Swiss-Prot record, chain D:
Assembly description: Binds to host ACE2. RBD also interacts with the N-linked glycan on 'Asn-90' of ACE2. Cleavage of S generates a polybasic C-terminal sequence on S1 that binds to host Neuropilin-1 (NRP1) and Neuropilin-2 (NRP2) receptors. Interacts with host integrin alpha-5/beta-1 (ITGA5:ITGB1) and with ACE2 in complex with integrin alpha-5/beta-1 (ITGA5:ITGB1). May interact via cytoplasmic c-terminus with M protein. May interact (via N-terminus) with host bilirubin and biliverdin, thereby preventing antibody binding to the SARS-CoV-2 spike NTD via an allosteric mechanism.
Record's function text: Attaches the virion to the cell membrane by interacting with host receptor, initiating the infection. The major receptor is host ACE2. When S2/S2' has been cleaved, binding to the receptor triggers direct fusion at the cell membrane. When S2/S2' has not been cleaved, binding to the receptor results in internalization of the virus by endocytosis using host TFRC and GRM2 and leading to fusion of the virion membrane with the host endosomal membrane. Alternatively, may use NRP1/NRP2 and integrin as entry receptors.
Highest taxon in the source lineage: Viruses
Phenotype upon changing T32A: In strain: Omicron/BA.2, Omicron/BA.2.12.1, Omicron/BA.4, Omicron/BA.5, Omicron/BQ.1.1, Omicron/XBB.1.5, Omicron/EG.5.1
Record gene name: S
Name of this chain's protein: Spike protein S1
Part of the whole protein covered: 345 to 393 of 1273
Outcome following mutation: S29P: In strain: Omicron/BA.1, Omicron/BA.2, Omicron/BA.2.12.1, Omicron/BA.2.75, Omicron/BA.4, Omicron/BA.5, Omicron/BQ.1.1, Omicron/XBB.1.5, Omicron/EG.5.1
Result after altering R2T: In strain: Omicron/BQ.1.1, Omicron/XBB.1.5, Omicron/EG.5.1
Length: 110, 49, 50, 49
């Protein structure tokens, strides 16, 4: 989609009370370890939400196809990405999170 | 009981890494002055007997 | 009960600060370490590198 | 200089950073060095959680 409607993801193990509350619009924010209570998400034009015992942080920097691959293995969380259907193109790594927690479910913010 | 008195005593400290079948009859104590592991007159230097 | 601390009190009752540091065993990815080495580099000589 | 009371001590969690142990070990302002198992050389050669 040629827009910025989608920005972040939510990951979780049991009832989305687990880690990985992401917000990757431009300046990728922390892959936090808080539990739950995100509340309002319609079209923030605001930031943040209710929080908890956060235990990690991170800050970094035809039509286009924003494509990602998410993996969790050996206690490491890995993300691969590309910006530009037929053809061939490899994916390069972005980060490597040593959080090492179980993930079994995920939803999207939009 | 009572017989053992300053007679049966072993070594506890480092440095001596003797090869098999060696007798380390010594009373080496760093009562001379150093810097890395303290060891000046009183700290990190005792009687290993 | 409140402590009684005065500059004229004895050494046994003198205030003292204690910090206890406890590190957990290896059961998760390591996050705390220390500086290793900063040895210089050489070229065109048979050397052992790490 | 501001520390909490003994009954209400403050717990600080330190992780995801590199720890410098030489500064503590090369300072005479400290008196107690009772550390179990670890020695000043050992703990700088491994990592913890
Ligand atoms: C860029 O980083 C700043 C941090 O100063 C943050 O407030 C801002 O939201 C980031 N940009 C975007 C688009 O999120
Ligand atoms: C954070 O997690 C620990 C371990 O489960 C728990 O004891 C603590 O209460 C939590 N913090 C909050 C604010 O809930
Ligand atoms: C993930 O689940 C397994 C088994 O369900 C458990 O042994 C492990 O401790 C869990 N990981 C975490 C970080 O709790």
């Amino acid at each position: 989609e040629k827009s910025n409607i989608i920005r972040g993801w939510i990951f979780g193990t049991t009832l989305d009370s687990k880690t990985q509350s992401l917000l990757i619009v431009n300046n990728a924010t922390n892959v936090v370890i808080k539990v739950c209570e995100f509340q309002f998400c319609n079209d923030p034009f605001r930031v943040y939400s209710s929080a908890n015992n956060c235990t990690f942080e991170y800050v970094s920097q035809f039509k286009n196809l924003r494509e990602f691959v998410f993996k969790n293995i050996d206690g490491y969380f890995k993300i691969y990405s590309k910006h530009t259907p037929q053809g061939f193109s490899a994916l390069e790594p972005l980060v490597d999170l040593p959080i090492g927690i179980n993930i079994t479910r995920f939803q999207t913010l939009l | 009981k009572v017989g053992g008195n300053y007679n049966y005593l072993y070594r506890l400290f480092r440095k001596s890494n003797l090869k098999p079948f060696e007798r380390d009859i010594s009373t080496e104590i760093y009562q001379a002055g150093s810097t890395p592991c303290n060891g000046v007159e009183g700290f990190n230097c005792y009687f290993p007997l | 009960q409140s402590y009684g601390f005065q500059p004229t009190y004895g050494v046994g009752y003198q205030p003292y600060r204690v910090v206890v540091l406890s590190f957990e065993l290896l059961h998760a990815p390591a996050t705390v370490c220390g500086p290793k080495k900063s040895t210089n580099l050489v070229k065109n000589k048979c050397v052992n590198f790490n | 200089t501001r520390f909490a009371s003994v009954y209400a001590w403050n717990r600080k969690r330190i992780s995801n950073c590199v720890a410098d142990y030489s500064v503590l070990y090369n300072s005479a302002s400290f008196s107690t060095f009772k550390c179990y198992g670890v020695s000043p050389t050992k703990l700088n050669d491994l990592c913890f959680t």
